[PDB]
Design an enzyme around this catalytic site. Structure first.
Site, PDB file in Angstrom:
ATOM      1  N   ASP A   1      42.094  44.525  36.310  1.00 47.38           N
ATOM      2  CA  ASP A   1      40.425  44.543  35.744  1.00 47.38           C
ATOM      3  C   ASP A   1      41.022  45.206  34.034  1.00 47.38           C
ATOM      4  OD1 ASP A   1      38.451  43.232  34.276  1.00 47.38           O
ATOM      5  OD2 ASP A   1      37.309  45.181  35.183  1.00 47.38           O
TER       6      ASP A   1
ATOM      7  N   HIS B   1      35.491  40.374  42.165  1.00 41.93           N
ATOM      8  CA  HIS B   1      34.488  41.408  40.987  1.00 41.93           C
ATOM      9  C   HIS B   1      33.225  40.328  39.151  1.00 41.93           C
ATOM     10  CE1 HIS B   1      36.918  39.598  37.625  1.00 41.93           C
ATOM     11  NE2 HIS B   1      36.579  40.880  36.781  1.00 41.93           N
ATOM     12  N   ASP B   2      32.120  41.195  39.473  1.00 34.57           N
ATOM     13  CA  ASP B   2      31.737  40.118  37.938  1.00 34.57           C
ATOM     14  C   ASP B   2      30.732  39.434  39.708  1.00 34.57           C
ATOM     15  OD1 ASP B   2      33.922  39.623  35.518  1.00 34.57           O
ATOM     16  OD2 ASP B   2      32.451  41.439  36.094  1.00 34.57           O
TER      17      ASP B   2
ATOM     18  N   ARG C   1       2.791  30.660  45.499  1.00 34.82           N
ATOM     19  CA  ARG C   1       3.511  30.131  44.895  1.00 34.82           C
ATOM     20  C   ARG C   1       4.945  30.864  43.817  1.00 34.82           C
ATOM     21  NH1 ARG C   1      -1.323  28.226  44.916  1.00 34.82           N
ATOM     22  NH2 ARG C   1      -1.560  25.878  45.295  1.00 34.82           N
TER      23      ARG C   1
ATOM     24  N   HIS D   1      38.298  33.847  33.831  1.00 30.41           N
ATOM     25  CA  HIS D   1      38.481  34.976  34.287  1.00 30.41           C
ATOM     26  C   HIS D   1      39.039  35.832  35.146  1.00 30.41           C
ATOM     27  CE1 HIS D   1      38.437  39.360  32.000  1.00 30.41           C
ATOM     28  NE2 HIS D   1      37.896  39.909  32.718  1.00 30.41           N
TER      29      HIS D   1
HETATM   30 MN   LIG Z   1      36.346  41.454  35.005  1.00 29.46          MN
END
Ligand SMILES: [Mn+2]
Ligand SMILES: [Mn+2]
Lengths: 503, 498
Positions: free
Chosen positions: A266, A115-116, A440, A67
């Site tokens: 976008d 982005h993302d 841990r 995308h």
């Molecule tokens: Mn997007």
């Protein structure tokens, strides 16, 4: 006055280059940024975070990465269109772009790719899982205005205590910040602090999508309601964004000018691809999709965008040579027709409002919420919302993701249910005798995240009365960094493993 | 002759083509259309689940064919930009017909990079091994190397060199050899033209015609072109199309498109460093040990050699994150020496590269730059490609593709009349298995088979020969178009273990 040599800043925060530099030298700086991003693990992880559909066996369906690549091409076109348009207006040299054509395009392209990048594992719902989990723990609303008799915050050091002290103001900000995780804010944190990418100022400005601070608690000013829609940077990056505002000639709350272009890319790519994937997943046929789009447009005329873009694609798909599939042909021309109308509009809007966009104060999107182009995009969203995002497989994935990120945070709750001296002892000694579980748990956190915690806390003044407040803020940022840095599949795997269900 | 790129950067298409004048801006928009076609193709998306060296991980820390192709695209971009910058400094840009084609020139390279490996079958080199081996045992292309032999081991009646009164034996010869030289580069041309029907620009397609040997070639390649004809570059099924392409790009027979050397150079460069970075991520060896393996494998060690300027330098930056620092500057130091060398090599040989007859790579041995790459490769072979997890995956991939082909033998073990009956009537009463197997084949492939067969003259004596060829391309299309995971799945599903 408009001079892009002042916005397209090729300096870096660390080990920076200085001194004149030719066009070719400046070209090389921004191509270096390109290589840094493309070879980043954060970009590679995008191929295993999900974009709408569950990411199944045949890669027919989009991922966050593919995308982004599609988005990157839409951003490229707008930038090329803006620049080409400006050359015909003779404004190219006048705007100081004649030696910056490449970088201008490149910064847009990388910001689209990026982005993302700060998005948590399950997208919108991972964010939800994070913020919900910390709200019950921090209750930022009980820190709105002066101490409350009984503060529901779980943490001693953060409780709005005894009707006194400014700290109460720091507590106010810390509690709000940690409960407003936002992918865009995490992206800045990611490229600067976690990955230590050392990008150019210009490049980082391109992914600073919104300018509201995460700790903001009121209604945003009337003048900036759009640029402050969502949080854009965290408390932990306030100093860094401060240096960025100065380097990019940004007023407070002003946006970098190339961000409007990436935002428009976008907005365009936001939906069409998800319908194409919906036809692939056999949810509805291309014929059914045309009529769902015909129905939701309503006021139909020979001449409208619908007629010029989506009706055009429907007719081309019927009786074509080039032995192409009907669906391949419909969506190809749905994509192209949409671009040919919406890219020039976005480019022109960018130019027509270039003064405020340059100053970074333009309180609108390029595809303005009014326009007919925004109506075409709303058309796609309306169909996608009622027929794709509502599909049970999608909705279940959203349910599953929310439980996975929620459950993970509880597994690491011990690291938070610890005093300062306790957690700090765990940081120095690798093996703490009496804290076997927390030990841990601490080592599973990725090395990059632990390093950023140590680095941030060490820069604090040791003796200050706000140190325990800052330490806790950074401890929580440590956990949110670890979780948000996972892929969908890694986070699912770790969840099942730490509940003991795999072998 | 003379160098004019207006004659190589051909923006026409094979179908529904544009003609007529076109301004500089219009030609740019044509080539930007190719970008959109490629980036939005399922065939690029399938690259994120085909493997590049290491098994796929649950957190995508390791490279895939898609992430790798993106890295290669960036190197290609740089070399292209560098050639253009050098050429403007030489004042040759307008002289060579490039001043209005700067954009497209860069873009065609970028896309060609993204599009190598697009035709690669599932398990890479080893899926290729499986396909060619399986068809070699069915067609025995070496038994058609000369005069017909009494015992033709070809399993197909119509493809055995019958008896001895034909030039049909010559077509049989080509079909048998062609179908046993599946090659991803050749599959890529087939994929972008016949299967995905992308209708790309001639220049864009010429950019991925990496080699000029036809898959049906049976003998020794000419001394003047041994490099360009190293591997097969196109199948018999695309012969006529590659003929239209050669005309459109002004290529002699066996000549290469000039921008291919750039893509080829970007492949050679980013081909190996990334796999070493991944080897350290998977904790196979430490960055320290890796430094020493490189020191040792460089053998003749000395001076201000390419090792000292590139890898010893990158080792030093890392001693003040550590692994990131070493590999970030290892890639960068390598590019800063090797990209300009290529840009120089390209211009220094621009006449032969333009004619498309230059029988060498832009890097190619000799050079200290190729010695650097060989250093990365030699270490990767001895210490990465030899790791059991890699070798196991290559073993498994070979069995998977082999087994998948056996599952579809029934479609191949059918007469012409039977297979044809299967194409028209969907339900053939007496062929229940072959019917159901046939439907599993992807629609785009089935549709390309139908179109291929229909263009043939029905009456010809060679018709049954062509159909078998297209039937075999049909199977090879289906298999090669899969991803690593889907093929493993189909194997398990059709062997019944899910
Ligand atoms: Mn997007
Ligand atoms: Mn490659």
């Amino acid at each position: 006055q408009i001079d892009f040599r002042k916005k397209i800043n090729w300096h870096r925060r660390y080990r920076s280059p200085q001194g004149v530099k030719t066009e070719h030298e400046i070209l090389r700086i921004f191509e270096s940024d390109r290589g840094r991003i493309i070879n980043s693990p954060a970009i590679r992880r995008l191929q295993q975070k999900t974009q709408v559909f569950p990411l199944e066996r045949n890669a027919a369906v989009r991922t966050r990465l593919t995308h982004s690549m599609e988005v990157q091409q839409v951003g490229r076109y707008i930038a090329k269109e803006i620049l080409s348009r400006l050359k015909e207006l003779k404004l190219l040299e006048a705007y100081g772009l004649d030696e910056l054509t490449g970088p201008f395009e490149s910064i847009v392209e990388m910001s689209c790719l990026m982005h993302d990048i700060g998005n948590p594992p399950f997208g919108h719902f991972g964010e939800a899982a994070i913020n919900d989990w910390f709200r019950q723990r921090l209750h930022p609303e009980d820190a709105e205005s002066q101490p409350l008799t009984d503060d529901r915050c779980s943490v001693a050091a953060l409780r709005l205590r005894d009707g006194e002290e400014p700290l109460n103001e720091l507590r106010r900000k810390i509690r709000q910040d940690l409960c407003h995780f936002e992918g865009n804010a995490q992206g800045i944190r990611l490229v600067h602090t976690l990955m230590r990418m050392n990008l150019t100022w210009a490049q980082v400005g391109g992914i600073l999508k919104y300018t509201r601070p995460a700790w903001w608690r009121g209604e945003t000013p009337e003048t900036h309601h759009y640029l402050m829609k969502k949080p854009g940077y965290y408390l932990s990056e306030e100093a860094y964004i401060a240096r960025l505002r100065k380097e990019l000639n940004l007023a407070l709350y002003s946006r970098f000018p190339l961000t409007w272009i990436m935002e428009a890319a976008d907005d365009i790519s936001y939906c069409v691809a998800d319908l194409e994937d919906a036809v692939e997943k056999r949810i509805f046929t291309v014929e059914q999709l045309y009529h769902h789009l015909h129905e939701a447009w309503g006021q139909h005329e020979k001449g409208s965008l619908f007629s010029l873009v989506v009706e055009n694609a429907w007719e081309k798909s019927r009786s074509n040579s080039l032995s192409r599939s009907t669906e391949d042909q419909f969506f190809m021309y749905l994509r192209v027709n949409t671009l040919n109308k919406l890219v020039p509009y976005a480019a022109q809007r960018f130019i027509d409002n270039l003064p405020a966009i340059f100053a970074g104060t333009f309180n609108h999107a390029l595809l303005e919420d009014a326009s007919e182009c925004s109506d075409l995009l709303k058309l796609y969203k309306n169909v996608a919302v009622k027929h794709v995002f509502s599909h049970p497989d999608v909705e279940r994935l959203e349910l599953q993701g929310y439980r996975v990120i929620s459950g993970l945070l509880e597994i690491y709750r011990p690291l938070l249910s610890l005093s300062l001296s306790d957690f700090t002892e765990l940081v120095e000694k690798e093996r703490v005798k009496r804290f076997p579980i927390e030990s841990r748990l601490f080592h599973k956190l990725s090395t990059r995240h632990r390093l950023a915690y140590v680095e941030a806390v060490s820069k604090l003044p040791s003796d200050s009365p706000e140190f325990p407040l800052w330490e806790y803020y950074y401890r929580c940022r440590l956990l949110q960094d670890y979780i948000s840095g996972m892929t969908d599949l890694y986070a699912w795997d770790e969840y099942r493993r730490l509940m003991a269900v795999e072998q």
